[PDB]
Symmetry: D2
Subunit: 224 residues, 4 copies
């Protein structure tokens, strides 16, 4: 069933990359999804999974062949990454992923975007943003752990595009998504790439992914 | 002149704790202050200094005596810290300090406060905030690397107090301050405690501390 | 060439697990093998790679099915890893992988074995060992970055077996290996499991893997 | 009591630097000394403490004086550390401190010295060593958490001196020490510097530090 939903997403959206479903990955999701898990643990496993996810996402960047010579004096043919990048987090949940990106990409520039749906209208509105000046020339790792209706990420993408970022240079790094959110992102910006660790079955009236994980943001920052 | 400034602050405000001015601390400050410092380096040293700063501030919490028995079956008389705490960052600069606090206090709850200075005047306005629910019952480590006019931190304190936080349970953790910001926080909230790594000379017309460090947030996050 | 090789090994040795040869993996490998890379970079990249290698190895462990209830008050079928394990470093090169293991397995027990080849005779001899008292009851993550002739690892496994560890519970974690090395380990202990990041062409006239990386321990600890 | 002892040592041994006995330091010491403390907790706190100890120790190195210009385009009077250094751990216990050193000094060179007492004879023999080739030209951060009779440390120092290391350039970094150990070190090598976090009252019949901590190496690596 999951397999079916998984395969369907996979054949329908060539631009999505699902992390390999290893037993460890599932053990981690198990801990974080459990409502019984304590904050310290949740944080620990969340950070652990984020590192893997980020490492996976970094493979979507472009690279060049590069040849070097070993200390044994023989050549080795490698493949360097030479592009300019930055991370852009969706406050506040996406900020939880910043440490992971910074752990592997030392001193990478981090932009931040704060968006909030209108109480009545539901239109996500941009409340605040601080981004690198030359973001237009960069590849961007857009971070947001949950992608439910996809309203916030679509708005985040809209502003990036307005700023001049090329759609095909956007890599959306996500932990958990709902098929519905995935479909919206691709209907609106077919050129972006998305990397996620899991696809659930549905979304509820309150807009939570199910079986899901609850509110990632409060669980992670402990404001629940 | 610094010494004199340092001492005057120390004699005038019993509630401020100045980190011991060791040569290593100075070395870190020079790297951080240096315009010429590359971003990866800035982050590395800023992170190093912040941890020391957080370790210092934690000493302001309350503790009880505790006695234990060593594996050698002999008693050791120590202490233990038993308070409920949380960190509250002032977005975005203060956010640079959360990782530091999370490194030593596993899974500590983190609240965030976004304050904006108004365009007409410049009175600070509360733009957004997400705090722990029982924050009123906790000691609060308030994070903001720079304290120039103290307009932002004073605004943050006002909201915390309005929510029920006891003024004397607020510990303001700061890296660099200006005598004037210091005087203001204490004239308004004489009971809070403040821990800083340095006190500079003055503020310019632009309200930057001098000699200072430039824009902390832009430098730490790379959004020049 | 390389593809042939990988294919043979994979085919002849069902117990070897080669990590997915991603572009990022290759990129890290290129920086670590490059004789011109500075000690800091070597260390940073080796650590990063070792972290991915351990995450991969962890999948070799036994796991139980586990169902949990999410905050949405709905069931999620996950898995749980229940075995007692420990890491066993082959001094000194294997020590470099300890931090990686401790990063993902907090407080995991770490055993150490120092094996040295006789200066004249070349026979590998056990010089020093310090292992957990109940190692026989645990799954062993045996750490050693390089596997050239396999002389060292074979001796290490021999001592573990004399202590009662089951051959089938040894997961040999390696960064780089030579075909001869892999062949020997499997001839002598067909039951262990081996996880590695790369397999080189051959050994030097002086028993060095080629193209290789050079002396990993000297490069990692900076004693070259 | 402890104050008496401390005063004597401080008075008689001008080269020992006791770290500031803060409530935090004490609470950390109370957890690591507790026989009831679980391994994960033991490791987390020792690591935290080692970090502060290492920062303290770094202040023993020589530094210049350096002026930089701030972003405010004003100059600042700082300092810089210009010495070639390296860390040398006394296997195994001393190894627990390497992470801390590498945390603050990226890619610092690490030498290793395994000294063991003859099982009949009781004396210290050098079993294995792997040091940087130019150690003779650097400042040595000698790492060993405990100092009871000082037999091991005195042997480690003898070996470094035979390699050409200057006595006055060794900074012995230690967590816990007994007065007799301190006395011995200085009887034999009056010019080294020693930085420590606690001075206990005495050794017991089995030459165990009391009240002490039990066997550090065993509790840290879990080979209890």
């Amino acid at each position: 069933q999951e397999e079916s939903i998984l395969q369907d997403i996979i054949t329908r959206f060539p631009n999505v990359v699902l992390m390999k479903q290893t037993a460890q990955l599932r053990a981690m999701m198990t801990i974080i999804r459990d409502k019984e898990t304590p904050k310290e643990e949740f944080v620990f496993y969340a950070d652990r999974l984020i590192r893997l996810l980020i490492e996976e996402a970094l493979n979507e960047l472009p690279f060049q062949k590069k040849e070097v010579t070993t200390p044994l004096d023989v050549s080795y043919h490698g493949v360097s990454f030479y592009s300019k990048i930055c991370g852009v987090s969706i406050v506040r949940a996406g900020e939880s992923m910043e440490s992971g990106l910074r752990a592997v990409c030392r001193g990478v520039r981090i932009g931040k975007i704060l968006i909030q749906r209108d109480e009545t209208t539901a239109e996500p509105k941009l409340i605040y943003e601080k981004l690198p000046a030359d973001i237009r020339e960069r590849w961007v790792m857009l971070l947001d752990p949950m992608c439910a209706t996809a309203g916030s990420v679509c708005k985040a993408i809209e502003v990036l595009l307005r700023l001049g970022v090329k759609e095909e240079r956007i890599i959306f790094v996500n932990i958990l998504a709902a098929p519905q959110g995935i479909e919206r992102v691709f209907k609106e910006y077919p050129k972006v790439r998305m990397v996620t660790a899991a696809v659930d079955i549905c979304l509820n009236s309150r807009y939570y992914i199910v079986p899901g994980i609850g509110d990632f943001g409060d669980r992670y920052f402990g404001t629940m």
